[PDB]
Structure formats: C-alpha cells, structure tokens
Antibody, heavy 226, light 214 residues
Framework: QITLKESGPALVKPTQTLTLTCTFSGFSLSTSGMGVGWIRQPPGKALEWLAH???????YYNPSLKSRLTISKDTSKNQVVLTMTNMDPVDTATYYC????????????????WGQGTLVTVSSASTKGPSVFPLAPSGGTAALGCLVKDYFPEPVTVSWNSGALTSGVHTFPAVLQSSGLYSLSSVVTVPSSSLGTQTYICNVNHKPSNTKVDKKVEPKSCDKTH | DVVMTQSPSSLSASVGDRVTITCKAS??????LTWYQQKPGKAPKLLIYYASNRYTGVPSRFSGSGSGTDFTLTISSLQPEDFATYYCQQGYRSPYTFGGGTKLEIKRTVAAPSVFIFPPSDEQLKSGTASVVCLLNNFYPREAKVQWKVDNALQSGNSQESVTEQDSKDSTYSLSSTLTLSKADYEKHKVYACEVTHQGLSSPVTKSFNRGEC
C-alpha cells in the first residue's frame, strides 16, 4: 500500500544542520505527475509548507527559507531528502512529508497521503532516558497509570498491554519541568473487579534515547510501610 | 505570496449544529483549494479537493464550495468525532500556503470529573524524589481548578497540570496535576490532598492520603 515515513534526528543543536529522510512505498517518483513535499508544524501552531520535488527533479522552496533548504530525491531507493541549515530553536516542529499524484489533472487530489511526521527539537541539551514509575490503583471503577519522568527530548509513546487496552486511556501532554527534563503520565480507567484477574502493563517507549520500558502496574499492599 | 485568511480561529458548537468555516484568499486561486481535518498529534486528513469535491470515504455531511477568493467548508450536522483543527490550503500557486486554522470544539452537557489521587511510588522514593499525581477524569467544560494542600497548607509554585485534547467519543477533557517534592520534603509532612473545583460539582471535591498511614 501507499506509505510515507519520516526519519531523522530527534535532536539538533543550534546553528547545526538538520537532515530528514522520507521513505515511501506503493508509488514511484519516476512516474510522471508524482512528487513529494515537506510541511512542518510547530506544537500548537499552523502548518507551514517547506519544499516540494517533482518526478522531473523540479524543485520548489518556501521563498523565506530557500537559503537554508535543500531538497533532493533518489528514485531507485524510494527516498526524498530535505536539508535545513542553521537550525534555530524556533525551528522545533513536527516535520511531515506528503505526496502528490497525477499533477494538474482531474485526478490530482492534492496532498492526499501524508507521513506520520517526525519531531525535531532544536536544543543543546543532552538526550536522557526516562524513569517509569507505577501509579497504583488502590467496587466501582478504579484508576491506575504510569509516571514517565525525567526524559529529553520529546516525544514519548505510551501504550497499554501492547495496544490491547485503549478504552479509557488518557496519556497527558508532557510538561517541561524546572530541571529542563520532560515528564508526563498515562492513566486508564478500569473496573475494580478486574484488578484481581487482569494484568496492566504500560509500554513506555522513548526513541531519542532508544529506551523501552514495559512496567506492570500492581495494586499496592499495606504491609512493608516504613 | 497568497495569504489564506481563515475564520473563525476557534468555534464551539453543539452536536447536530450546522458549522460553516470561511477561508479568504488575498488573491484569486481559482478552485484549487484543499480542506484538511487534523486530529491533535496526527497528520492532516484530506476532506475536500478542488474546493468542492468530497474525497473518497469522507462523510456526506462535509461539503465545500466557492471559487476565486471566497471559500466555505460546511459541516451539515456536527458530530462528536468532528473535533479537530480544520485547515484550508491553496494549491494554485507555489509556495503553497495554509490558513490559520479553525479549532472546532464540541459543545456538550456539563460533566463532573472523577477525581483520583496517587501517592509517590516506592521506586521513586528510593531514587530520592516524590511526585503526587491528582487525576481529573472525563469532565466538561474544560475550565477546572486544582488546589494542593500539604498538612492543609495551600501550595503554590510546586505543581504542574496537563490537559488532554477533547475526546472524540464523549467530548470531555481529562487533567493531570502533579505535585513534586524532594523525598526529604515529602517526609516532613503527613497529609497530602488535591481539591477539585468544577462547574459540574455542587461543592469542591477533595481526595487525600496520609503518608505512612496505609
């Protein structure tokens, strides 16, 4: 099927150069009328178009960013590369790639296929993996969760029971703590009856540090309380 | 460049209402306009291509119209799953430009939050810090106030709250307020409580625990 996947560093120091990679399947850049572009979105801000490359290597750039942007393609490897120089903290954003097809015809639906996006943080701080702590539940409903503390940079993905548990889950947006490290929590509402039988494991994944934590959330006892 | 001016920047309408979003171009862009629906944290989904053609799979309540400079996205009967930020985009001239976006909120009935409090884990206490988490679950409207009390002393400057985006099913919000202390500070006091004030509560609700009193 048609796919687009962004790849690049989650962390770029100021003044340094960012290099992003878009890998796709289900279509070819050699086909006439095909093209891939780049769009970025700062957190909570509007979408901003960056560049676009066509099947015939015709390149188009955001005029205000053209002096920093370099777009290229490798049709054989199904890859598009964007290079952005002199990265500024304001360049921290989610970077998307999207594809066009059948250019200029009635079948040109615009940018109908997008990638997931990749988050790039412009900062000088070091990468740090998170610590994962449980939020113990304790017959109506009960709430349990996991604390994902002291990591950098964003993002962190949290799933429960490897995606099998999605109903009632709340993963909260991270907050930059006073220490310069991020911290969030992910909670889930479950019936109290399941606490004795059902197992709950929060699957924390922080790719910038290549850290994976599977943490089982156990009900807390009142013995060993010192 | 072609400037796309979108209005309103945000909107709160009820389920079943008729929503109209306006996008004005600073110069003629013919009918080469695109409408996107974007959920938070996800890539924009294509709704309408060429200003008025519904993309395959888009529900029929979504319609677009207009050409030249004035464009309109119309949701005939608003649905809970329609919470999103909606963007217009012209493809008539490179550089492609976007409108500011319309953040569409679903207006629903008032819902009181479920409140839970989580004392610090023994793992974190072993590492030297202590975080107390106060959970506010599934409430509406978004406006809520969380106050921390330690030995019944009002706290300030040592807590951080975080709110989820609107639920695409029940249209509520959830909030996470965290109180952070060093282990030495946590062991200096016994009573920890978060007090939740919300419109859906007849009186403020407080969840508490006593350190060392399981």
């Amino acid at each position: 099927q048609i796919t687009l996947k962004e790849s690049g560093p989650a962390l770029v120091k100021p003044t340094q150069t960012l290099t992003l990679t878009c890998t796709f399947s289900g279509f070819s850049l050699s086909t006439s009328g095909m093209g891939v572009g780049w769009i970025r979105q700062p957190p909570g801000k509007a979408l901003e178009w960056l560049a676009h490359i066509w099947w015939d290597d015709d390149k188009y750039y955001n005029p205000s960013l053209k002096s920093r942007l370099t777009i290229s393609k490798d049709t054989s490897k199904n890859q598009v590369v964007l290079t952005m120089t002199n990265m500024d903290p304001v360049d921290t954003a989610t970077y998307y790639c999207a594809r066009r097809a059948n250019y200029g015809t009635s079948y040109d639906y615009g940018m109908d296929y997008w990638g997931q996006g990749t988050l790039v943080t412009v900062s000088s701080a070091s990468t740090k993996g998170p610590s994962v702590f449980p939020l113990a539940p304790s017959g109506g409903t009960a709430a349990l969760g996991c604390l994902v503390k002291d990591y950098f940079p964003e993002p962190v993905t949290v799933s429960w029971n490897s995606g099998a548990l999605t109903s009632g889950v709340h993963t909260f947006p991270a907050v930059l703590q006073s220490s310069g490290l991020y911290s969030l929590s992910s909670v889930v509402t479950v019936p109290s009856s399941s606490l004795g039988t059902q197992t709950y494991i929060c699957n924390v994944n922080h790719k910038p540090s290549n850290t994976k934590v599977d943490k089982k959330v156990e009900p807390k006892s009142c013995d060993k309380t010192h | 460049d072609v400037v796309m001016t979108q209005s309103p920047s945000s909107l709160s309408a009820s389920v079943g209402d008729r929503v109209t979003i306006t996008c004005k171009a600073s110069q003629s862009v013919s009918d080469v306009l695109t409408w996107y629906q974007q959920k938070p944290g996800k890539a924009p989904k294509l709704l309408i291509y060429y200003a008025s053609n519904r993309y395959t799979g888009v529900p029929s309540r979504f319609s677009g119209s207009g050409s030249g400079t004035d464009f309109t996205l119309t949701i005939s009967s608003l649905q809970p799953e329609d919470f999103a930020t909606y963007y217009c985009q012209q493809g008539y001239r490179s550089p492609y430009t976007f409108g500011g976006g319309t953040k569409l909120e679903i207006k629903r009935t008032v819902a009181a939050p479920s409140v839970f409090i989580f004392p610090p884990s023994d793992e974190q206490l072993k590492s030297g810090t202590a975080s107390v988490v106060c959970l506010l679950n599934n409430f509406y409207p978004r406006e809520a106030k969380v106050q921390w009390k330690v030995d019944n002393a009002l706290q300030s400057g040592n807590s951080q709250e975080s709110v989820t985006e609107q639920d695409s099913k029940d249209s509520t919000y959830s909030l996470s307020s965290t109180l952070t202390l060093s282990k030495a500070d946590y062991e200096k006091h016994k009573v920890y409580a978060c007090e939740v004030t919300h419109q859906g509560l007849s009186s403020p609700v407080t969840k508490s625990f006593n350190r060392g009193e399981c």
